[PDB]
Amino acid sequence: GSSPPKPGDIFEVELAKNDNSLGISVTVLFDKGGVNTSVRHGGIYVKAVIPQGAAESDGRIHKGDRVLAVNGVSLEGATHKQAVETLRNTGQVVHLLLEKGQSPTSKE
């Protein structure tokens, strides 16, 4: 008993290294996507998913935001090893739990 959680809040992105399982540019809006930017869960901020799908296929959309866990690991400021590493290692098989808590508009 469950329901598919859509983006705009706590969204997770799962893909199995098959066709795509990543495709985002990190540190673009942030210093390294995941972190603990300023919350109690983490806080990945990015450009998000590539234009040609990829992570977008992984369904890891949202440029600049706050993740609870990345690649499955809770990036509550862990990054260094876990979160940042996942950004770089993403794809093999990625599972992400994100928490939508942006501020500015979708462009402004």
C-alpha 90/C-alpha 22 separation (Å) is 6
Residue type, 73: V
| Strand, coil or helix: 49 | strand
- Give the closest residue to 67 by CA, choosing from 92, 33, 90: 33
Walk me through the domains of the chain, giving residue ranges and CATH numbers. Answer: 1-108 (2.30.42.10)
The experimental technique behind this entry is: NMR
Q: What CA–CA distance (Å, rounded) separates 76 from 58?
A: 22
- Token pair listed for 41: 């869960």
| Inter-residue long-range contacts of 77-85, CB under 8 Å, 24+ positions, other chains counted | 77/35, 77/36, 77/42, 78/34, 78/36, 78/42, 79/32, 79/33, 79/34, 79/35, 79/36, 79/42, 82/34, 83/32, 83/33, 83/34, 83/35, 83/42, 83/44, 84/32, 84/33, 84/34, 84/35
Three-state DSSP class for residue 55: helix
Alpha-carbon gap, residue 12 to 95, rounded angstroms: 7
- Distance (Å, rounded) from C-alpha 85 to C-alpha 63? 18
Distance CA 96, CA 67 (A): 8
